[PDB]
Every structure is written in structure tokens, then in C-alpha cells.
DNA sequence: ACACTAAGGAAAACTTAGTAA
DNA sequence: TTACTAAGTTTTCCTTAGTGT
């Protein structure tokens, strides 16, 4: 998991490390420590946990695993598109 | 990491589990077991390893962590596009 | 409040060994 | 060959407890 992506999206959601952990299912007495290790690169959440985090952060989970800033923005933008716009991007390269 | 993405990409690259592991720097005696566990969901590789797999598999790594099939397809296509065509999509992905 | 950290106990991965398909 | 697993160690994470910012 990329810590730049966690941080950025968390800031954009405008919440603390701890409240992110709490909203994602981590006990209040571990949330702050755990989310900080995640965000400072000390440990990695498992994939289940990153899914909960992403839901909480309102992003597609794969955004947290995308090193390419351009592809990352495409994923981000694709997240707010409707099936109309999403399909028209589908055949857009086809 | 999503086991189906790993499997589908490994089969599209046309190599076996063991060979993929060896090309990712896993000792040849650990590779078969280790890649099999990854692809059956017994165990999950770390992101550093996932990056090495993607490189072998000639894919963007985040493909392996995309549950949405339509986003995953978008990722693969973007993958194959050259630098110039990336501008075109980028321009459209804006505002 | 919020961010951050070492240290231990707990959990999950890696290596080994070997069996089918 | 290629796919796959149980076991025990290694490695990593999760919890605690608490400092700094």
C-alpha cells in the first residue's frame, strides 16, 4: 500500500488518523497507533482492511495501490462518473 | 490481493506459477509453493513482491487490487496505450 | 487533540517436504 | 511438469503504553 495515497485521500476526507481507523472498524485503543504505522509505512493493512479504509475514504480501493499518478487520477475520476459516463469512457479507446 | 487477477494475468502471460515466482526473485525451491499459495488465497504477498509480479506480468500493479471488473479492464487498456494516447484520455478525464 | 513510537504478544507469511493431476 | 498442501519456523502485524507536537 502507498502511504502518499492513504494520506492524501484521508486529508481530502478531512479526518484524523484515529477517526479513520475507528470508522473502519478498529478499536479506539488501537486506531491511532495502527493508522499511523499504516500512514508512516511501518506496517501494511491486509486487503480486507484496505477495503474498509477505502469505503470510509470514499475511494476505489486500488487507488491505494496505484503508483502512477496519472492512472491514480483516472481511478479517482472514474469513481464519480455515472454508468452513462463510465460506459462512454469504456468504448472511448475501443 | 485478488486471486483471480493474479491467475488471469499469469495465464495471459503464458507462464506457470513456479516460473513467475522465479522471475520475481523467489528461490526456485520456494517459488512453486509460494506462488501457488498466492494464487489460491492461502497467503497474500507484500506490495514489494506484488510490484515484482506485475513487472513480470507486464501489468500495472493496482490491477491485482481492483475488484471492479470494469475498472480493471480500463486499467489494462491504459496499460497498453503509448505516451501520446495517454494525453488524450487525460484530457478527457478532467474538469 | 493529534501524530508518532518501541516493545511485546499475536497473527500471518515463508520454507520445507512431499503428494497428486 | 505443473499444481497444490500440511507443518513449523520466520517474519510481520496488532496491542499497549506512553512521549512529543
Residue numbers in the entry:
A (entry chain A): 1 to 94
B (entry chain B): 1 to 95
From the paper:
The best diffracting crystals were obtained using 21 bp duplexes corresponding to the core sequences of the OL and OR operator DNA. The C.Csp231I–21-mer DNA duplex complexes crystallized in three crystal forms. For the OL complexes (space groups P61 and C2), the resolutions obtained were 2.30 and 2.75 Å, respectively, while the OR (P61) crystal form diffracted to a resolution of 1.80 Å. The DNA duplex in both complexes is significantly distorted from canonical B-form DNA, with a bend of 39 and 43° for the complexes with OL and OR, respectively, similar to the value (41°) observed in complexes of C.Esp231I with the OL operator. The bend is stabilized by amino-acid contacts to the DNA backbone: principally electrostatic interactions with the phosphate groups on either side of the recognition site. A comparison between the OL and OR structures reveals minor conformational differences, and these are principally in the flexible C-terminal region (residues 86–95); the latter are unlikely to be significant given the flexibility of this region of the protein. There are no base-specific contacts with A9/T13 in OR (or the equivalent G9/C13 in OL), which is the only site within the 15 bp core sequence that differs between the two binding sites. The same is true for the A2/T20 (C2/G20 in OL) and C19/G3 (T19/A3 in OL) base pairs that lie outside the recognition site. This is consistent with the DNA-binding affinity at theses two sites being effectively identical. EMSA analysis of C-protein binding to the left and right operators showed no differences in affinity between the two sites (data not shown).
